[PDB]
């Protein structure tokens, strides 16, 4: 299908275009402010669908586009957002085009311009760069659609099946969050480089907000150092922490090194040797028997570390053993729940 996109250089425009060239075989005709009149007319005359994203006689850009479409024999469909609706209804009646009229709320997502009156864009950009932000009123209710919903809704429309809610085409998943919640979320995401915590990804708004925030990071600033606890035996490094799904860390043991020899009451772990080779050993606290699990990066398998078994880990190889360690709780030096016991 020949699809034209007006205001192609805008926020939604770039998002839709990128998506449309990647996931469909439609020919996309982009039009914008520097498009020549001969190129605009040619596009609208061969279009099958028009996504419109853009008094002394001066006619609006919109009306100019509608008057040109007047001469497209194929009565192509027209999609747009209201923010003069009655005018568009009359255009559809007279010329025959199905024209989907949406009323989008405020938007957010990647590629929106910072410091040009989209308050979310500005906040992400500034917070990622440690810049003083202005919060006029934390209690202001926002009505938002994420960019992915807009884009996904437009594609439903392109195939003749748009979401209708009470007479009008309506993009699903609108959010209502106050400004304070947004700012707090933003600062929390930045803090998470320091404390290794993760966002609440089953909160749709938050997950959407986290992705959009990342997109505003300076290009020199994608990575952050981890705190390696290094000594002559190897290193132990925390990676991610969570209050509800435990935490993962990296243990590196040099050749011939044994670590552990402790047991836990309630703390438990999952060991994944991803490089090198060695043995994970267990003895029940009240018992004689030593049980050995020989493991290596050659064959990825998790060893659960059940409660009440003392356990140790040894490198048997002539290179460093690296083990991914999941633990069921964030470690607390007050209540370590770890008791030294050999074997």
Region 167-206 residues binding a second copy, contact defined as CB under 8 A: 198-202
Which of 24, 242, 258, 296 is the binder for a second copy (CB under 8 A)? 242
Alpha carbon distance, N-terminus to C-terminus of the chain: 70
Q: Between 81 and 242, whose beta carbon lies closer to a second copy? A: 242
Q: Between 140 and 302, whose beta carbon lies closer to a second copy? A: 302
Map the footprint of a second copy across residues 260-319, applying CB under 8 A: 265-268, 270, 272, 274-275, 282, 284-286, 289, 291, 293, 295, 297, 299-308
110 binds a second copy per the rule CB under 8 A: yes
- Evaluate whether 174 touches 145 at the Cβ level (below 8 Å): yes
322 binds a second copy per the rule CB under 8 A: yes
Q: Which of 132, 133, 110 is nearest to 182 (CA)?
A: 133
Classify strands 77-81 and 99-102 as parallel, antiparallel or unpaired: parallel
CA distances from 168 to 4, 5, 81, 82, 217 (A): 23, 22, 11, 11, 37
Least gap, CB of 268 to a second copy (angstroms): 6
- Evaluate whether 226 touches 237 at the Cβ level (below 8 Å): yes
Least gap, CB of 253 to a second copy (angstroms): 12
89 binds a second copy per the rule CB under 8 A: no
Map the footprint of a second copy across residues 11-40, applying CB under 8 A: 14, 18-19, 22-23
Q: Which of 100, 110, 204 is nearest to 153 (CA)?
A: 100
CA distances from 343 to 242, 287, 339 (A): 31, 11, 13
129 binds a second copy per the rule CB under 8 A: no
Q: Which of 245, 193, 195 is nearest to 214 (CA)?
A: 193
Segment near a second copy (CB under 8 A); pick from 55-63, 160-168, 179-187, 323-331: 323-331
- Evaluate whether 124 touches 212 at the Cβ level (below 8 Å): yes
Least gap, CB of 79 to a second copy (angstroms): 20
Order across the sheet with 269-275: list the strands: 228-230, 234-241, 247-253, 321-327, 269-275
Q: Between 61 and 239, whose beta carbon lies closer to a second copy? A: 239
140 binds a second copy per the rule CB under 8 A: no
253 binds a second copy per the rule CB under 8 A: no
Q: Between 94 and 232, whose beta carbon lies closer to a second copy? A: 232
Segment near a second copy (CB under 8 A); pick from 33-41, 55-63, 83-91, 211-219: 211-219
Rama region for 106: left / alpha / beta (φ>0; ψ in -120 to 50; rest) = beta
């Amino acid at each position: 299908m020949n699809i034209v996109i007006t205001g192609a250089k805008g926020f939604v425009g770039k998002n839709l275009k990128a998506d449309l060239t990647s996931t469909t075989d439609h020919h996309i005709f982009e039009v914008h402010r520097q498009t020549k009149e001969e190129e605009l007319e040619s596009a609208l005359l061969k279009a099958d669908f028009i996504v419109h994203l853009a008094s002394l006689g001066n006619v609006s850009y919109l009306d100019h586009v509608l008057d040109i479409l007047t001469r497209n024999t194929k009565k192509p469909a027209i999609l747009l957002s209201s923010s003069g609706e009655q005018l568009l209804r009359e255009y559809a009646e007279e010329y025959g085009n199905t024209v989907y009229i949406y009323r989008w709320p405020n938007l957010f997502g990647k590629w929106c311009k910072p410091n040009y009156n989209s308050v979310i864009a500005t906040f992400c950009y500034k917070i990622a760069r440690n810049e003083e932000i202005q919060v006029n009123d934390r209690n202001v209710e926002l009505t938002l659609n994420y960019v992915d919903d807009i884009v996904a809704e437009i594609k439903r429309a392109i195939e003749g099946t748009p979401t209708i809610e009470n007479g009008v085409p309506t993009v699903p998943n609108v959010f209502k969050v106050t400004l304070g919640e947004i700012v707090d979320l933003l600062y929390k995401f930045k803090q998470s480089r320091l404390d290794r915590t993760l966002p609440k990804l089953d909160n749709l708004f938050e997950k959407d907000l986290y992705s959009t925030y990342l997109s505003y990071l300076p290009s020199t600033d994608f990575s952050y150092p981890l705190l390696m606890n290094v000594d002559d035996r190897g290193s132990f490094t925390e990676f991610i922490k969570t209050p509800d799904r435990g935490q993962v860390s990296v243990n590196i043991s040099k050749p011939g090194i044994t670590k552990g020899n402790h047991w836990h009451h309630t703390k438990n772990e999952k060991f994944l040797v991803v490089s090198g080779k060695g043995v994970i050993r267990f003895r029940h606290v009240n018992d004689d028997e030593i049980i050995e699990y020989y493991v290596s990066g050659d064959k990825l398998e998790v060893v659960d570390i059940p409660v009440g078994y003392t356990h140790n880990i040894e490198n048997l190889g002539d290179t460093d053993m690296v083990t991914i360690m999941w633990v069921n709780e964030m470690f607390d030096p007050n209540q370590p729940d770890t008791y030294f016991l050999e074997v």
